[PDB]
């Protein structure tokens, strides 16, 4: 076995390995660090890539970012995505 920092994951409702550090500075980054598992975070990144490819999204387009931000919030909220 190994040693891992773990958190009660808001998405999966179970104790899982957490991130080693917040993904970025700020309140949102802190929320993710404290309440989102590494698995949930990784699964979100995979889903985000899928959405960007399937919808032809551009991170520099405000609407495309808004869409992704709305899906991320839903994805990591605790609800069934």
Curated annotation (Swiss-Prot):
One of its GO terms (biological process) is cellular response to oxidative stress. One of its GO terms (molecular function) is iron ion binding. Keywords: Iron. GO terms for cellular component: cytosol. Could be a mediator in iron transactions between iron acquisition and iron-requiring processes, such as synthesis and/or repair of Fe-S clusters in biosynthetic enzymes. Belongs to the Fe(2+)-trafficking protein family. This is Probable Fe(2+)-trafficking protein. It comes from Pseudomonas aeruginosa (strain ATCC 15692 / DSM 22644 / CIP 104116 / JCM 14847 / LMG 12228 / 1C / PRS 101 / PAO1).
């Amino acid at each position: 076995g190994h040693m891992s920092r773990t958190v009660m994951c808001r998405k999966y409702h179970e104790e899982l390995p957490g991130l080693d550090r917040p993904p970025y500075p700020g309140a949102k980054g802190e929320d993710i660090y404290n309440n989102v598992s590494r698995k949930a975070w990784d699964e979100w990144q995979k889903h985000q890539t899928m959405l960007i490819n399937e919808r032809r999204l551009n991170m520099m387009n405000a609407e495309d970012r808004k869409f992704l931000q709305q899906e991320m919030d839903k994805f990591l909220s605790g609800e069934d995505y």
